[PDB]
Design a protein around this ligand. Structure first.
Ligand SMILES: [Ca+2]
Ligand code: NA
Length: 256
């Protein structure tokens, strides 16, 4: 209740026009003040190259960057950068990989048990987006689905070192009907599509194992969203919008 409940999503802010139709971009919520490097991942299929820009302003105003080449390629757009590592779904697998950016090596590899992959339980936009990793106020999560949950979204807390599952919740929401999803304060928010008409219309509260139908609309400025994640440090939503990297601010309601 203290941490906050989503009540509103701001106008989309265009930060850059770049890259293909589909991709992801993000900052590291546990980077020290003021390490404000931008991490950038173009493409959804068999890709390995991560761009590192020095700052938000360098990201916006230049096309200069450090490149990293992942020893394994990723699927989808569901990566997350967390405490100096990139977490991602190995191409054509339900394998999750922790790639340490400080040493430029893989630190951990592990199967995400029972997770669908290879366009089995993609988000509605497709693109091998079966497994979505994200970070909120309390840590690392994986958002996916399983046969046993009938293709409905499954949410698991993930240990950032072991990559083992710490706790799992089964929701009622068919992942392939979700445009995308993100977590704020332990609540999973799911969008109705990737081109509407867009809005957050389902919330699943993990602390109470309860879901609710809600209506928090937000503007899809460039007509296709293929990535959408919350950053707890920035308190913003990062999105890839049809070859545009955009930010939304949000409002949370707090009860102390
Ligand atoms: Ca997401
Ligand atoms: Na993600």
């Amino acid at each position: 209740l203290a941490c906050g409940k989503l009540t509103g999503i701001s106008d989309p802010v265009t930060v850059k026009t770049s890259g293909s139709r589909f991709g992801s971009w993000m900052t590291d919520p546990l980077a020290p003040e003021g390490d404000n490097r931008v991490w950038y991942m173009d493409g959804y299929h068999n890709n390995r190259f991560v761009r590192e820009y020095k700052s938000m302003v360098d990201f916006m105003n230049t096309d200069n960057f450090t490149s990293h080449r992942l020893p394994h390629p990723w699927s989808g757009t569901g990566q997350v950068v967390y405490n100096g590592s990139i977490y991602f779904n190995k191409f054509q697998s339900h394998i999750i990989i922790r790639f340490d950016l400080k040493t430029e090596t893989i630190l951990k590899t592990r199967s995400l048990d029972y997770a669908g992959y290879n366009n089995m339980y993609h988000y509605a936009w497709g693109g091998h987006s079966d497994i979505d990793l994200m970070v909120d106020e309390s840590g690392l999560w994986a958002v996916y689905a399983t046969n046993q949950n009938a293709g409905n979204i499954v949410v698991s807390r993930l240990d950032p070192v072991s990559l083992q599952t710490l706790q799992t919740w089964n929701t009622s929401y068919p992942k392939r009907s979700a445009g995308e999803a993100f977590i704020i304060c332990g609540t999973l928010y799911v969008t109705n599509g990737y081109s509407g008409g867009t809005k957050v219309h389902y919330a699943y509260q993990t602390n109470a194992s309860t879901y609710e139908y809600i209506d928090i609309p937000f503007q899809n400025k460039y007509s296709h969203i293929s990535m959408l994640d919350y950053n707890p440090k920035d308190r913003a939503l990062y999105a890839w919008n049809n070859g545009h990297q955009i930010l939304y601010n949000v409002t949370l309601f707090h009860v102390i």
